[PDB]
């Protein structure tokens, strides 16, 4: 019967929060009071990515730390040269509705989504010398945002259908199917150890999935609107998300509940995208007040503000050897800081 | 030039790929580009035949004007997280059946719809074609059953004109904002050719006043 | 991917010949394109170049005011027309395919090319001999010495090495010092210090035996060195 199953359900969820709640005993806020802060940081425009005629809505860095890519709402996937304003490549979309781009770890492949609901694989390394979709992905009942390669033959997608698939190349066809989210999931974050990965939904909760059994590990609370962006810390035990609510929060995986959140109350706009550090130390969030904040991941502080653009920061990263981040707003400017 | 024969011809290739990717803005940005929005399959089928997974792009010219349709509709997702995707369209094509005031009711969910859409954060300086579709159906409801079941608050009868009128002034009624926006409303029915021409009519009045607002003058 | 030639012939001296390169299977649009000839017993020498949708015309010192090279970007074609042919001009020249992006790899695909025979500062390189003996199944290392460091500030090191098959086009194998090329066997390896560079070969097999040539691409003059011949 449905309510004797509900209840016992809500108790079982009542059981899950006294666990956690017993489990936490100390803040992170407390232990992290005996260190000093990192102090101010002005990171400067190094470079500006000025080549888009419309707004950006993701970008993503390479595993060389120079190449990037970015997606615009013209249908146009830019391939970048960080150490230059060079553009590798630049290439037309079938769907100018994209709301998400990843460059494969191995920097032969860039994938994009949107409203079309299909996430488009691009060979970049090709004997034909020009870039041609490679197996474009479909199967999702809606809008796909945040792609992220898992390899160079799997890719994990998030959708505005309340799934995330897990999808092999060659053959598409949305091998492992995460579902258990009541809301669209807006982004996903894949573990560095390449084995979970964690996504945020418009549910106001997050999830840790298991890429091989397919089952939801873990799933975490706290936010009251919609989880626009997720990242996780570089050793792959935390992850932060970044939600409508104007806050930012610094979940993890060992436990089950939050140790920080980075909130101010002079910001009221929610964030788009957050990023970490090479360390960790700094906590990069793209917000919806026209600029990006500098947060000190261990303390609960501001340690800078990115320079405001001329729109919302959509999209963030930041290299694999941490040297410098880049931010990509509605606008259509992509900044490098350093 | 302190730079090698590699990067040289890197920065060579840049600018290649930024003048054909200007061309291609200007061309993107010289065609119109228009968004429908019905209330349940109220006529956007319709409309689209009568101008000719995922969202569905729909192209077509009339006078020399490129015209890109977005249908959405099968996303069926929360709107609020890819509405902002289509702020800057030049109109949004709004469609709702006429004969469905006694068909909660059906007119009053395009009255929240629409309510929904023209005030909105996004479509604030976007203006709207309304489209009030199946208008002979609407006069055969009005000639076998009252008007007054829809609106408890009506003043009218059975005539056919003030029904339509008074629908219609409710649609208007539903913008907040009627000096950044104006709704361009249109009666039309199947098998009516005169509806491109409302719609190519109706945006090119948006294409000047946009142009206007943008030098100063509106 | 194809980049077949047509043209050549036997020319009286002072004469023209109008030099075809038809592109096929590549964006043709996106490639640099060069030329590249040899003596019929001499190593490679560099002839002239277009970059992507024109633009760089650049020359050789040998060939500047001769040897106009256009494109036909539509019709995926290249030409070089060939103005006072001296006896000098006896070479099988190349069209050779190239792109210069990040990361890319310029000369990987090399036309069959035509003969042509015509009846009677810059970088220098030059490699260990003219030949260099060694059984199959062996590691050898071959080496070649430029004047001018190849190493520019931006930390690539611009030199290239080719192999050229007895009787087949030369195929890339490093195009730039220690980077190894794309269809190639993974024995074949690259190294240098900035003037100095050795090539090593890992145990080479049967099909591995050609003529070795070093080219730098620092200064836009390319020059190629002395082949190294492998007995078989």
């Known amino acids: 019967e449905l309510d004797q199953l509900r209840q016992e359900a809500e108790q079982l969820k009542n059981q899950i929060r006294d666990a956690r709640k017993a489990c936490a005993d100390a803040t992170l806020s407390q232990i992290t009071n005996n260190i000093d802060p990192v102090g101010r940081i002005q990171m400067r425009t190094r470079r500006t990515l000025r080549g888009h005629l419309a707004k950006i809505y993701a970008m993503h860095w390479g595993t060389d730390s120079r190449l990037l890519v970015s997606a615009s709402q013209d249908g146009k996937l830019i391939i970048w040269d960080s150490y230059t304003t060079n553009k590798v490549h630049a290439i037309p979309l079938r769907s100018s509705w994209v709301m998400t781009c990843a460059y494969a770890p191995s920097g032969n492949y860039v994938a994009c989504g949107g409203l079309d609901n299909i996430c488009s694989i691009y060979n970049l390394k090709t004997r034909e010398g020009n870039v041609r979709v490679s197996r474009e992905l479909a199967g999702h009942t809606g809008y796909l945002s945040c792609c992220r390669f898992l390899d160079d033959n799997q890719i994990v997608t998030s959708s505005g259908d309340t799934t995330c698939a897990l999808w092999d190349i060659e053959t598409g066809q949305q091998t492992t199917t995460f579902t258990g989210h009541t809301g669209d999931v807006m982004s996903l974050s894949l573990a560095p150890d390449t084995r979970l990965f964690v996504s945020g939904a418009c549910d106001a909760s997050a999830k840790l999935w298991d890429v091989r059994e397919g089952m939801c590990r873990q799933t975490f609370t706290g936010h009251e609107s919609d989880i626009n962006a997720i990242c996780f810390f570089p050793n792959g035990n935390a992850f932060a998300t970044g939600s409508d609510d104007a806050t930012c929060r610094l979940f993890d995986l060992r436990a089950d509940q939050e140790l920080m959140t980075y909130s101010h109350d002079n910001i009221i706009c929610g964030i788009t995208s957050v990023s970490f550090s090479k360390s960790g130390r700094l906590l990069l969030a793209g917000y919806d007040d026209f600029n990006c904040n500098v947060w000190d991941a261990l303390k609960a502080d501001r340690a800078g503000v990115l320079a405001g653009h001329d729109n919302r920061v959509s999209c963030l990263g930041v290299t694999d050897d941490g040297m410098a981040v880049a931010t990509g707003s509605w606008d259509s400017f992509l900044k490098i800081w350093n | 030039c302190t730079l090698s024969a590699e990067d040289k011809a890197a920065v060579e290739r840049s600018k290649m790929i930024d003048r054909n990717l200007r061309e291609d803005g200007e061309k993107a940005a010289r065609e119109v580009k228009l968004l429908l929005l019905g209330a349940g399959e109220s006529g956007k089928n319709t409309i689209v035949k009568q101008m000719k997974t995922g969202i569905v792009e729909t192209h077509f010219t009339f006078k020399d004007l490129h015209f890109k349709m977005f249908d959405v509709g099968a996303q069926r997702s929360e709107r609020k997280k890819w509405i902002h995707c289509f702020e800057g369209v030049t109109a949004i094509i709004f469609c709702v059946a006429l004969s469905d005031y006694d068909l909660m009711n059906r007119m009053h969910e395009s009255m929240k719809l629409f309510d929904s859409i023209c005030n909105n954060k996004w479509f604030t300086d976007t203006s709207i074609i309304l489209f009030l579709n199946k208008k002979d159906l609407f006069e055969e409801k009005i000639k076998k059953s009252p008007l007054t079941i829809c609106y408890p608050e009506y003043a009218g009868s059975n005539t056919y004109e003030e029904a339509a009128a008074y629908i219609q002034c409710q649609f208007e009624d539903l913008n907040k904002r009627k000096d950044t926006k104006e709704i361009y409303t249109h009666f039309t029915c199947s098998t009516d050719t005169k509806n491109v021409q409302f719609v190519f009519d109706a945006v090119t009045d948006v294409l000047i006043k946009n142009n206007l607002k943008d030098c100063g003058l509106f | 991917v194809q980049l077949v030639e047509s043209g050549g012939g036997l020319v009286q001296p002072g004469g023209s010949r109008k030099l075809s390169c038809s592109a096929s299977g590549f964006a043709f649009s996106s490639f640099g394109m060069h030329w590249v000839r040899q003596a019929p017993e001499k190593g490679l020498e560099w002839v002239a170049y277009?970059?992507?949708?024109?633009?760089?015309?650049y020359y050789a010192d040998t060939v500047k005011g001769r040897f106009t090279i256009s494109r036909d970007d539509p019709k995926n074609t290249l030409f070089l027309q060939m103005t006072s042919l001296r006896s000098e001009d006896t070479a099988m020249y190349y069209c050779?395919?190239?792109?210069?992006?990040?990361?890319?790899?310029?000369?990987?695909?090399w036309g069959q090319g035509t003969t042509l025979t015509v009846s009677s500062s810059d970088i220098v390189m030059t490699q260990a001999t003219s030949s260099v003996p060694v059984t199959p199944g062996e590691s050898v290392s071959i080496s070649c010495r430029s004047s001018?460091?190849?190493?520019?500030?931006?930390?690539?090191?611009?030199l290239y090495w080719f192999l050229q098959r007895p009787g087949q086009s030369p195929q890339l194998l490093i195009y730039?010092?220690?980077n190894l090329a794309s269809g190639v066997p993974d024995r074949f390896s690259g190294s240098g210090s900035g003037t100095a560079f050795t090539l090593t070969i890992s145990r080479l097999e049967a099909e591995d035996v050609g003529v070795y040539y070093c080219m730098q691409h620092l200064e836009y003059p390319l020059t190629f060195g002395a082949g190294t011949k492998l007995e078989l």
């Open positions: 730039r010092m220690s």
């Open positions: 277009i970059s992507s949708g024109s633009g760089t015309i």
């Open positions: 050779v395919r190239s792109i210069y992006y990040y990361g890319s790899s310029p000369f990987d695909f």
């Open positions: 001018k460091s190849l190493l520019h500030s931006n930390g690539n090191t611009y």
